[PDB]
């Protein structure tokens, strides 16, 4: 991805986006109880913790584009992955407006708490001023869609979230795009059935984990990925995507039955128009993280990429024996024979991708079930029921999270969520977590689950059939 044109918003009539410059994250009541090194990401140029130029850092992931045609390797990769998706019978029929907006099986209701994007943010019009959970009203939305139309600019925000000491110092804060409510809606109508099918079918057929429930999904992963594991990381995946990968994504959707006109929304994601504060700019390539379906599309593209690299490096590869599960850039895969990921990384580099060893490793080492992580979680077989696998979020991560809050009024939900993550670390670690939480008065005002209850409910969850 690359920035192709920048201008002062006022020269083109756009008002300045008044995006918050102060973090909503504050130290929580548990900040002193637990240890941690993460702090809120830098959100403004003047941050005294900066040790690099902010604006440069944030836009630096737009490393450029490789200007290539869709090659032979890509074509076979698309064909192989389209073959899997075909077995899913994804309907390319538009999703009915109400289903797209207010919720349906496999596609949660449009989040009414996130930004409505442009022009709404400039007019003080919030999603809630247009939409109604209670009434499922669509009259106002339609007025809005007709009045303002589609293909509106995206609003660029700096993601307000915890980051490592090093990422704070380097101003390496993440940018997310707020698609206009009009474009979000039109995209959910166009691809909603694909979103639903993906959400209902995490695994090796969609090659996606988007929308999965790790508590349940983890036990399936080693059944699905039964060869020698393959895993590696990308650096700035989203912004590194060149247009060629979107071209591949468009071919893939066409094989699925989408018309050329329907894939036009992919051009909207690729060659994009943004507002960042007082600037207005155009980008060619790069997935604009935050728009409708970005995790799904990123995941689909990853399926094309990895197959492409294997086909390129290993001419004798048999893709029918390759398996992978992606969540955007995050991947866990397997092949029955050992595969040299450093080789795949060099191939990727020729395609404008930056792949590094898994988990900040120095060498493309062997990935084992002991060291493998996915969605930041390790895999640990239950001691009593070996076929059940615990998703293990490191206690360090749980500690980082508990020390800060964006709204202390949600302490109960926040802590409960962390408890659902923590117990997988074991009874001793859990009792210690709980003891430390209760070492401050707020901790004793909370309804915290008992370990035995967590374990029991986890074991019972595997009893209830799940719709696919």
């Amino acid at each position: 991805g690359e920035i192709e044109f920048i201008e002062s918003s006022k020269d083109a009539g756009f008002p300045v986006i008044n995006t918050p410059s102060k973090t909503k994250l504050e130290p929580s009541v548990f900040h002193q109880v637990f240890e941690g090194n993460k702090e809120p990401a830098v959100l403004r140029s003047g941050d005294p913790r900066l040790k690099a130029n902010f604006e440069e850092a944030i836009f630096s992931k737009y490393i450029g584009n490789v200007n290539t045609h869709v090659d032979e390797y890509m074509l076979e990769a698309v064909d192989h992955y389209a073959g899997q998706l075909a077995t899913l019978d994804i309907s390319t029929e538009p999703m009915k407006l109400e289903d797209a907006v207010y919720g349906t099986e496999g596609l949660e209701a449009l989040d009414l708490t996130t930004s409505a994007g442009y022009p709404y943010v400039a007019l003080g019009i919030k999603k809630r001023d247009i939409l109604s959970k209670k009434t499922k009203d669509l009259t106002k939305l339609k007025e809005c869609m007709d009045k303002y139309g589609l293909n509106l600019p995206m609003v660029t925000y700096v993601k307000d979230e915890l980051r490592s000491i090093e990422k704070v110092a380097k101003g390496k804060s993440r940018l997310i795009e707020a698609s206009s409510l009009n474009d979000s809606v039109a995209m959910r109508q166009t691809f909603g059935n694909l979103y639903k099918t993906f959400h209902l079918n995490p695994g090796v057929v969609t090659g996606s984990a988007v929308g999965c429930d790790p508590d349940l999904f983890w036990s399936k992963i080693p059944v699905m990925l039964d060869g020698h594991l393959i895993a590696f990381d990308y650096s700035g995946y989203d912004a590194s995507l060149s247009p060629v990968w979107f071209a591949c994504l468009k071919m893939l959707l066409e094989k699925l039955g989408y018309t050329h006109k329907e894939t036009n929304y992919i051009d909207y994601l690729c060659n994009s128009h943004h507002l960042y504060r007082d600037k207005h700019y155009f980008v060619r390539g790069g997935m604009p993280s935050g728009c409708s379906g970005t995790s799904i599309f990123n995941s689909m593209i990853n399926n094309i990429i990895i197959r492409t690299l294997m086909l390129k490096v290993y001419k004798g590869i048999d893709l029918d024996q390759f398996r992978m599960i992606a969540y955007g850039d995050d991947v866990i895969a397997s092949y029955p024979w050992p595969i040299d990921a450093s080789l795949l990384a060099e191939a990727g580099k020729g395609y404008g991708l930056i792949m590094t060893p898994a988990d900040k490793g120095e060498c493309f080492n062997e990935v084992t079930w002991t060291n493998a992580t996915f969605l930041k979680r390790y895999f640990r077989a239950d001691e009593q029921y070996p076929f059940l696998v615990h998703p293990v979020m490191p206690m360090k991560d749980i500690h980082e999270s508990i020390r800060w809050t964006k709204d202390p009024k949600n302490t109960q939900d926040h802590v409960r969520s962390l408890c659902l993550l923590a117990w997988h670390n074991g009874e001793h670690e859990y009792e210690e977590f709980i003891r430390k939480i209760r070492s401050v008065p707020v901790g004793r005002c909370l309804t915290l689950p008992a370990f035995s209850t967590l374990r029991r409910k986890w074991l019972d969850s595997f009893h209830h059939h799940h719709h696919h």
Binding site: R380, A381, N425
Partner: peptide, 9 residues
């Protein structure tokens, strides 16, 4: 996979 007792996190 590894079991918790055999491997920690």
């Amino acid at each position: 996979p590894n079991q918790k007792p055999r491997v920690p996190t």
